[PDB]
Amino acid sequence: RPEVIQSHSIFEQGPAEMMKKKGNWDKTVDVSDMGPSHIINIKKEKRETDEETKQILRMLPKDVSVAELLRELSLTKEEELLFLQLPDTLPGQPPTQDIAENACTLADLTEGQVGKLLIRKSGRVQLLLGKVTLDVTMGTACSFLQELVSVGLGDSRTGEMTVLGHVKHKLVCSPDFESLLDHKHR
């Protein structure tokens, strides 16, 4: 091992370093795309973060309920799948179900128009439902795959399964508590 060393500190050529590098790592052999060596560009590995699954190329944004629904209506007009959550109990009451105060669930109502959604100035969003209104808020974001499916139990021995589409967004409902207290003081 060499003991006598004379170091250097005069300004070196940065381009010389960059060219040394270039000659050391830029001698591409990517033309070796042989049979055992193809890679499907859709079949890469992935990042720890879904939002940036782009470590090698070929060579989430903030939003609000009013903006998303306005975008949905305006820039496109096809059909979308939405997943949403309601308050534990709906404002209605059981429809002649002979009742413990069982919660009025969506599953226990007849079909047809159930209400309206209203968007106000300043972008505030509410849901009109009978004599009351429920608040709506954009849920926690999602980045991993969610698939909507319908399971057909056509027979006790076997059935059928057909896909319907993927889910992109979530919505959260809420009671407007302060409105309830203002309507009914305590």
Task: Indicate whether 4 belongs to the interface with another protein (CB under 8 A).
Answer: yes
Interface positions, 44-63, toward another protein (CB under 8 A): 44-46, 48-50, 55-56
- Contact between 175 and 136 under an 8 Å Cβ cutoff? The reply is no
Q: Which of 67, 70, 118, 148 binds another protein (CB under 8 A)?
A: 148
Instruction: Write down the least CB distance from residue 185 to another protein, Å.
Output: 9
Q: Which of 63, 71, 123, 159 binds another protein (CB under 8 A)?
A: 159
Q: What is the DSSP string of 31-61?
A: T---GGG---TTS----SSGGG--SS-----
Please say which residue, 126 or 179, places its beta carbon nearer to another protein: 179
- Contact between 165 and 148 under an 8 Å Cβ cutoff? The reply is yes
Three-state secondary structure call for residue 186: coil
Task: Indicate whether 122 belongs to the interface with another protein (CB under 8 A).
Answer: no
Nearest-angstrom CA–CA distance, 58 and 41: 8
Longest distance between any two alpha carbons in the chain, whole Å? 99
Please say which residue, 66 or 91, places its beta carbon nearer to another protein: 91
Task: Indicate whether 80 belongs to the interface with another protein (CB under 8 A).
Answer: yes
Please say which residue, 121 or 174, places its beta carbon nearer to another protein: 174
